[PDB]
Amino acid sequence: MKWDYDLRCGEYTLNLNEKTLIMGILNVTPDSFSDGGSYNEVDAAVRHAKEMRDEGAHIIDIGGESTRPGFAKVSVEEEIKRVVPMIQAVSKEVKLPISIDTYKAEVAKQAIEAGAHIINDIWGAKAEPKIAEVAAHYDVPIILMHNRDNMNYRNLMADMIADLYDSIKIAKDAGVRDENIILDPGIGFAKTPEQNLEAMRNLEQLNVLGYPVLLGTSRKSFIGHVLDLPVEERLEGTGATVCLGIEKGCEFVRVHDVKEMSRMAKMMDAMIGK
Amino acid sequence: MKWDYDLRCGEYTLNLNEKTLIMGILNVTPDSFSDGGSYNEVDAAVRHAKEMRDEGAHIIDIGGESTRPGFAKVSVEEEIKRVVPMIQAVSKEVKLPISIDTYKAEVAKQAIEAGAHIINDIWGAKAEPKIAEVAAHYDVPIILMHNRDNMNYRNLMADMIADLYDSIKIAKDAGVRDENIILDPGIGFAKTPEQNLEAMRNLEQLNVLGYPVLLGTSRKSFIGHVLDLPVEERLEGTGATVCLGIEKGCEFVRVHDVKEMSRMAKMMDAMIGK
Numbered sequence: 001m002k003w004d005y006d007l008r009c010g011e012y013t014l015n016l017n018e019k020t021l022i023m024g025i026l027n028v029t030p031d032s033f034s035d036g037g038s039y040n041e042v043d044a045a046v047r048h049a050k051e052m053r054d055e056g057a058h059i060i061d062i063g064g065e066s067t068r069p070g071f072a073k074v075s076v077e078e079e080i081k082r083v084v085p086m087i088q089a090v091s092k093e094v095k096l097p098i099s100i101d102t103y104k105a106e107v108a109k110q111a112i113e114a115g116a117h118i119i120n121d122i123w124g125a126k127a128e129p130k131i132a133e134v135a136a137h138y139d140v141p142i143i144l145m146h147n148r149d150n151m152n153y154r155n156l157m158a159d160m161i162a163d164l165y166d167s168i169k170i171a172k173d174a175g176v177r178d179e180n181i182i183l184d185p186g187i188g189f190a191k192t193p194e195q196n197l198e199a200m201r202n203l204e205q206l207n208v209l210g211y212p213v214l215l216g217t218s219r220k221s222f223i224g225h226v227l228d229l230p231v232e233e234r235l236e237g238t239g240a241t242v243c244l245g246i247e248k249g250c251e252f253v254r255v256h257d258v259k260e261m262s263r264m265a266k267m268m269d270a271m272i273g274k
Numbered sequence: 275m276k277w278d279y280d281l282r283c284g285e286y287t288l289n290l291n292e293k294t295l296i297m298g299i300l301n302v303t304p305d306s307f308s309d310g311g312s313y314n315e316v317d318a319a320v321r322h323a324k325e326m327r328d329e330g331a332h333i334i335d336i337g338g339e340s341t342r343p344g345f346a347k348v349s350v351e352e353e354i355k356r357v358v359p360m361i362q363a364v365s366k367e368v369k370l371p372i373s374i375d376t377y378k379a380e381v382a383k384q385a386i387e388a389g390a391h392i393i394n395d396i397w398g399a400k401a402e403p404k405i406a407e408v409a410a411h412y413d414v415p416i417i418l419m420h421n422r423d424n425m426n427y428r429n430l431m432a433d434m435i436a437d438l439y440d441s442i443k444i445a446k447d448a449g450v451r452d453e454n455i456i457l458d459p460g461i462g463f464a465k466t467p468e469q470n471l472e473a474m475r476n477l478e479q480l481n482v483l484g485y486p487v488l489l490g491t492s493r494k495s496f497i498g499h500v501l502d503l504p505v506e507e508r509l510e511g512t513g514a515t516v517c518l519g520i521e522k523g524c525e526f527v528r529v530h531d532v533k534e535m536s537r538m539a540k541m542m543d544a545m546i547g548k
């Protein structure tokens with residue numbers, strides 16, 4: 001009874017109370033010889049989305065070249081040629097809500113038009129505030145991630161909450177309804193390894209803002225820093241972050257390893273009484 | 275600064291503050307044609323103890339036939355022929371403290387004489403109270419596990435704490451020092467699947483007794499009940515229990531999958547600030 005509403009996603013509806021929601025990460029695998037839409041590139045995305053669906057994903061998060069982990073400099077024009085064909089094919093062939101991982105308003109707009117249901121913004125409407133106008137107009141959920149162009153904090157948690165509020169204000173001023181706001185602490189962004197640990201340790205503070213929280217820690221550098229393990233050897237590390245996140249009240253986890261993290265989340269949910 | 279003493283284990287000393295301690299599970303693989311001590315049987319145990327050492331174990335827990343998971347009916351005379359050669363070889367070849375997983379006083383005595391450092395009692399000194407006299411005499415740590423010959427609880431957590439106190443009283447009356455007492459909630463013993471979940475959910479209550487807590491959930495039936503997965507597919511499930519246990523303050527985890535659980539524990543420790 002924590003949430004008195006469900007997350008409305010067009011033809012899909014996500015219950016926020018019954019289980020931790022698993023968002024599976026789908027990064028584009030660009031064909032070297034085309035700008036987008038080619039069979040090998042799109043077929044790869046579809047096959048991967050189907051696998052994640054079969055492994056327990058509730059949302060498929062689709063990211064083009066300009067987003068994490070690559071951060072390529074690419075025009076919205078180029079970005080649309082690549083992202084839109086993926087959204088079209090995945091939305092047709094995979095019966096799950098799709099999030100578009102972009103900070104660019106025009107990309108978000110075209111993605112929603114192509115069939116995406118949720119906007120996932122690593123800059124929390126601060127890089128391109130018009131993304132909040134797009135969100136409001138289409139009445140879609142938007143995930144506002146904590147992020148900064150600096151790591152000069154006075155007090156990490158207090159600053160994160162203040163920064164997240166600045167994002168909330170941008171979204172609400174644009175007309176985004178409270179029920180369409182989700183927050184993300186931005187673990188692995190604009191934070192030292194030590195600061196990432198401190199944010200994990202204090203994640204429950206985000207709950208005072210009164211919005212659902214999505215945690216995205218999967219395979220991130222700070223896990224490698226602790227364990228001294230490369231990106232492919234971080235299942236256990238990611239797992240610990242997912243478990244602690246759920247214990248601290250997060251509603252979503254954004255993960256690469258859907259099969260394993262879905263099992264861990266299900267076990268956590270059972271134990272905490274979710 | 276939670277603990278103002280270290281766990282003294284003869285030539286070994288375990289710090290209770292710096293990391294979650296990993297106890298690796300070693301079950302005997304009985305040779306069919308002998309009562310104990312044979313090369314294949316003991317070599318198997320030694321090889322396994324070395325692997326667990328290399329994978330991050332801090333304690334090796336050695337169990338003969340009459341203990342979990344098999345619970346064979348076997349005389350102390352038979353049990354000694356099997357357990358003592360394992361302890362002798364493992365203690366010589368593997369530089370870690372050894373716990374003997376037995377509820378039988380005479381087995382515990384001979385095990386300590388053979389080189390074991392810690393007594394691990396699934397009956398918490400209630401099946402054979404003389405085991406507490408053995409513990410006191412040799413001045414070794416003893417793990418008192420919650421257990422009952424029934425599941426008729428009036429109130430699970432309150433009953434567990436009362437039962438654990440009855441074990442503490444037996445141990446202290448026998449002369450066991452406070453610094454040599456460790457408690458275990460007995461997840462998977464004398465509890466319904468639902469009760470096991472409830473005990474996990476409320477594990478932090480055990481901390482009021484003021485003794486270190488060891489959690490032993492590895493691969494247990496209740497994980498299979500939640501996930502509907504067989505014993506070999508419970509890494510993720512065990513992982514969630516380990517993470518939640520550490521968050522709730524446990525000092526030890528008793529696990530089969532040392533490599534994976536050691537990594538998860540290290541990540542948890544870093545995040546909680548242990």
Ligand SMILES: OCCCc1nc2ccc(C(F)(F)F)cc2[nH]1
Binds near residue numbers: 123126148149
């Ligand atoms: O300290 C808060 C920073 C907010 C912020 N506004 C930005 C605009 C553009 C970009 C860029 F375009 F990605 F470079 C990054 C930004 N970061």
Ligand SMILES: OCCCc1nc2ccc(C(F)(F)F)cc2[nH]1
Binds near residue numbers: 400401421423424
């Ligand atoms: O309800 C608390 C039960 C305490 C208890 N005393 C026991 C003695 C012997 C055995 C046995 F020998 F293993 F059967 C099991 C026991 N259980």
Ligand SMILES: OCCCc1nc2ccc(C(F)(F)F)cc2[nH]1
Binds near residue numbers: 236259513534538
């Ligand atoms: O399914 C992947 C192949 C087998 C496998 N390796 C694992 C490592 C760690 C964990 C973890 F402990 F749950 F994180 C689960 C795993 N399962």
